[PDB]
UniProtKB/Swiss-Prot annotation:
Protein name as catalogued: Zinc finger Y-chromosomal protein
Annotated source species: Homo sapiens (Human)
Zinc finger motifs (C2H2-type), residue ranges: 3-26
Localization terms from the record: Nucleus
Family: Belongs to the krueppel C2H2-type zinc-finger protein family. ZFX/ZFY subfamily.
Free-text function comment from the UniProt entry: Probable transcriptional activator. Binds to the consensus sequence 5'-AGGCCY-3'.
Gene: ZFY
Domain remarks in the Swiss-Prot or TrEMBL record: The binding of ZFY to DNA is mediated by the interaction of the GGCC core base pairs with zinc fingers 12 and 13.
Coverage span on the entire protein: 570 to 598 of 801
């Protein structure tokens, strides 16, 4: 019951955590 990121290699326990990670790490922060 884990989710993974398909940009880099970070994983989560709760999908929201993952979403946030991509939002603050990939998904254009610029
Ligand atoms: Zn990532």
């Amino acid at each position: 019951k884990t989710y993974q990121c398909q940009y880099c290699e970070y994983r989560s326990a709760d999908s929201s955590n993952l979403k946030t990670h991509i939002k603050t790490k990939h998904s254009k922060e610029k």
